[PDB]
Ligand binder design. Structure first.
Ligand SMILES: CCCn1cnc(C[C@H](CCCN)C(=O)O)c1
Ligand SMILES: [Zn+2]
Ligand SMILES: [Zn+2]
Length: 304
């Protein structure tokens, strides 16, 4: 059975994508945007009250298999949408005016692998020529400074960028969906863990986006909002001044497509538990993260 306060295996998440859709037909529709290396359907939930020509926000979770709190967060976001639509002013305004494309688990194959064999798996589960080493880092596989600094050319590395940009079925599917819906997607949010940061572009080169000042003040404000609940401390900034290079990211790629609000969220903790964040922190982590995501959503809605 599914629980929003526990980590759910893929079979349970997949069943939940179907059930949450059938239980909430006037707010949610489900599609499959492609299949993974292992043939699993990559489900996408479109959350919002259907209406003519609505702007959208795209959010994905589970790029990196071991970052289980990310997968939990996408599910919590849907939980919140369903639960509070009609019961709280902001969420119902959000669902009435915007559509949210929520991709709960991008790297399904890796996620399954973290449940069956290796809790610390990160990459996809595709095969690489000339080696028995498996997988490509999906967040080094986008066409954004592809395979430059911070992305490894070695297939045995955790940061391998793949044989080519969009070599992975999962990243090709995501990129295809975004390119096909570029005129409506106004923001791109990608959920990861750990380290408690809100990043924005650029991580493939030492350069700053043209709307750097705007993104910095929004990230700063979202960090402040997140902290109000439990005092959790996040850092933020463009990759260029905040982290070491990490070329081939989807945030940078989405931004270079023209999606001006493109953010990577790295959730709890700061390293005590790292990727193995206890289930007892799911609720609090998701609740505080909701405050930042809603802050960003509200901002986007006011900046259309
Ligand atoms: C200990 C935290 C490590 N961690 C895990 N996941 C991430 C997300 C970044 C995003 C980089 C900007 N595209 C990355 O893919 O490197 C960081
Ligand atoms: Zn990650
Ligand atoms: Zn709540």
């Amino acid at each position: 059975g599914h629980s929003y306060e526990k980590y759910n295996n893929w079979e349970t998440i997949e069943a939940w994508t179907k059930q949450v859709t059938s239980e909430n037909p006037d707010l949610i529709s489900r599609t499959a945007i492609g299949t993974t290396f292992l043939g699993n359907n990559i489900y996408l939930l479109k959350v919002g009250k259907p209406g003519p020509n609505k702007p959208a926000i795209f959010m994905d979770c589970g790029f990196h298999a071991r970052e289980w709190i990310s997968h939990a967060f996408c599910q919590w976001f849907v939980r919140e949408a369903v639960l509070t639509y009609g019961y709280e002013s902001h969420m119902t305004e959000f669902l009435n005016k915007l559509d949210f494309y929520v991709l709960p688990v991008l790297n399904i194959d890796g996620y399954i692998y973290t449940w069956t064999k290796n809790r610390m798996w990160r990459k996809t589960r595709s095969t690489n020529a000339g080696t028995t080493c498996i997988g490509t880092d999906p967040n080094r596989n986008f066409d954004a400074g592809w395979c430059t600094t911070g992305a490894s050319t070695d297939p045995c590395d955790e940061t391998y960028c793949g044989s080519a940009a969009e070599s992975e079925k999962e990243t090709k599917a995501l990129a295809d969906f975004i390119r096909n819906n570029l005129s409506s997607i106004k923001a791109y949010l990608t959920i990861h863990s750990y380290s408690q940061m809100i990043l924005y572009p650029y991580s493939y080169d030492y350069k700053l986006p043209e709307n750097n000042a705007e993104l910095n003040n929004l990230a700063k404000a979202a960090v402040k909002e997140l902290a109000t609940l439990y005092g959790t401390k996040y850092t933020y900034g463009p990759g260029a001044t905040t982290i070491y290079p990490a070329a081939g990211g989807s945030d940078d790629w989405a931004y270079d497509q023209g999606i001006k609000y493109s953010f990577t969220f790295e959730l709890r903790d700061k390293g005590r538990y790292g990727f193995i964040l206890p289930e007892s922190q799911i609720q609090a982590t998701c609740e505080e993260t909701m405050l930042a995501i809603k802050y960003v959503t509200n901002y986007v809605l006011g900046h259309l």
